Amino acid sequence: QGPAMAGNLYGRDGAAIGSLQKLRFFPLAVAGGQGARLVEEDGRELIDLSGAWGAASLGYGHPAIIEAVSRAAANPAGASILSASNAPAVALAERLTASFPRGTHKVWFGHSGSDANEAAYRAITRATGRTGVIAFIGAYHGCTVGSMAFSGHSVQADAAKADGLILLPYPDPYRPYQDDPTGDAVLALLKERLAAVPAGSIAAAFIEPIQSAGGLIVPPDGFLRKFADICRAHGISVVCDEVKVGLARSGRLHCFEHEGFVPDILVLGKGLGGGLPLSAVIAPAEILDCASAFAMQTLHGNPVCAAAGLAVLETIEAENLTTAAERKGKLLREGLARLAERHELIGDIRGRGLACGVELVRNRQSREPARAETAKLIYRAYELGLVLYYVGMNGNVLEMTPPLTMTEDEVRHAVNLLDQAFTELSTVSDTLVSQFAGW
């Protein structure tokens, strides 16, 4: 790399910021954003089908986010919820509880999905005395020591795991455990694992209602309701992690609304803040009131980020974004089915609303994953003006989680750009794509 490429924004990023937190697939180097488009240092525009991993729920520069953040910065109700009550945080907590099936639940605020899942686990173990926990292989609950302890994805494979962690296979309709498409075999497994440990010893069960980093996997019909029944028969708290697929994105406000059960605890994050760091736990009062000064960080519940979160909730109502996500997700999956009529690499199209996955395979009969082709496809897409990433334990699932405010015209254009990327993925050399580590 010569001095011009070293001196550009991507080169500067390599010299100034450590690799420790990087997850890079192509040399995306951003200086601005407007609507559903990113703008690079050189001025090139790109359509963002990733929506910053679902964080950009209202896109970039939405008037309701500008209004809220500018107003709170000019007259901030202090900087915290720890040693003061503040008006924006309390208003946000009452709006979140009103959205969840009155009187029984309170809120905890954090910065991230990692800190929220960690606080939910510590609180249950403090309040019940129980130390064990159930979660899934492929599950992504965070990237801190406390949240990696009950995760199951490759990012957390070398982390220290909780005492009494029971890790189960997540039932995948495309690759079913024990060749049982229903998931009943995973339920029977859970019952056997509970019998090998002392009774009443499990505090909690963490579940994603659609596994995202694990592969954009929607579980079989009725599995999650049956799983939640088992847990309730053993006195185990059911924690629904909606950090990625929550808050209108599924075509219902809360993803569990598709699944015929109500969890004990709901965890929120990513698009809750609209581009600012904001997470929440909605839990029984007895769980969140078992201690004080116990799980706290100084800027938790700051009024700037709370104002952004109130703007996201208000805009979901005012712009009818739950219905929009349902309608636009149908249009996107219809487009992708037309591409599958010519591109044999597409093996499966799945998801809910504007949480969509397309699984790439070397052959439709064998279902053998196509990792190398997936990495080149998204590189070619980036060259053509479209940003998307891949997920899954085999690296072969394209993920689409656009801003909820993406237009229909933008959805159609993105499908057309993807068609070209499928046709021309082999134009990206082996040597170029190997400069990006991915996951």
Ligand X SMILES: */C(=N\[C@@H]1CCCCNC1=O)c1c(COP(=O)(O)O)cnc(C)c1O
Q: Which residues are catalytic?
A: 140
Each residue 23-62 as x (binds ligand X by CB under 6 A) or -, in order, gives: x-----------------------------x---------
CB of 121 to a second copy, least distance (A): 9
355: Cβ contacts below 8 Å, ≥ 6 apart: 54, 210, 212, 216, 244, 245, 249, 250, 329, 401
CB of 338 to ligand X, least distance (A): 27
Q: Which one, 35 or 173, has the nearer CB to a second copy? A: 35
Tokens of 187: 């339920």
- Distance from first CA to last CA of the chain, Å, rounded? 24
Each residue 8-47 as x (binds a second copy by CB under 8 A) or -, in order, gives: -xx-xx-xxxxxxxxxxx-xxxxxxxx---x--x------
**427-432: long-range contacts, CB 8 A cutoff, minimum separation 24:** 427/380, 428/376, 428/379, 428/380, 428/383, 432/379
- The binder of ligand X chosen from 132, 171, 263, 269 (CB under 6 A): 269
Tokens of 171: 């039932």
Query: 350 near 218, Cβ under 8 Å?
Result: yes
Each residue 87-126 as x (binds a second copy by CB under 8 A) or -, in order, gives: x-xx--xx--x--------xxxx-xxxxx--xx--xx---
Question: Which three-class secondary structure state does DSSP give residue 267?
Answer: strand
Using the contact rule CB under 8 A, the part of the chain among 131-139, 144-152, 325-333, 411-419 near a second copy is 144-152
Query: Taking CB within 5 to 8 Å according to partner kind, which of ligand X, a second copy, none is near residue 276?
Result: a second copy
Query: Taking CB within 5 to 8 Å according to partner kind, which of a second copy, ligand X, none is near residue 435?
Result: none
292: Cβ contacts below 8 Å, ≥ 6 apart: none
- The binder of a second copy chosen from 5, 44, 61, 314 (CB under 8 A): 61
- Neighbouring CB atoms inside 10 A of 74's CB total 7
141 near ligand X, rule: CB under 6 A = yes
CB of 77 to a second copy, least distance (A): 4
Q: Which one, 82 or 318, has the nearer CB to ligand X? A: 82
- The binder of ligand X chosen from 212, 237, 322, 374 (CB under 6 A): 212
Query: 151 near 393, Cβ under 8 Å?
Result: no
Using the contact rule CB under 8 A, the part of the chain among 128-136, 141-149, 359-367, 419-427 near a second copy is 141-149
Q: Which one, 161 or 234, has the nearer CB to ligand X? A: 161
How far CA 293 is from CA of 108, 235, 297, 298, in Å, comes to 12, 27, 10, 11
Compute the distance between CA of residue 328 and CA of residue 299 in angstroms, rounded to an integer. 36
Question: Which three-class secondary structure state does DSSP give residue 111?
Answer: coil
Query: 273 near 72, Cβ under 8 Å?
Result: no
Compute the distance between CA of residue 325 and CA of residue 249 in angstroms, rounded to an integer. 6
CB of 431 to a second copy, least distance (A): 19
* Number of residues that this document lists for the chain: 439
298 near ligand X, rule: CB under 6 A = yes
**With CB under 6 A, what is the number of residues at the site for ligand X?**
20
Residues making up the binding site: 113-114, 298
What are the residues binding ligand X (CB under 6 A)? 23, 53, 82, 112-114, 140-142, 208, 212-213, 241, 243-244, 269, 296-299
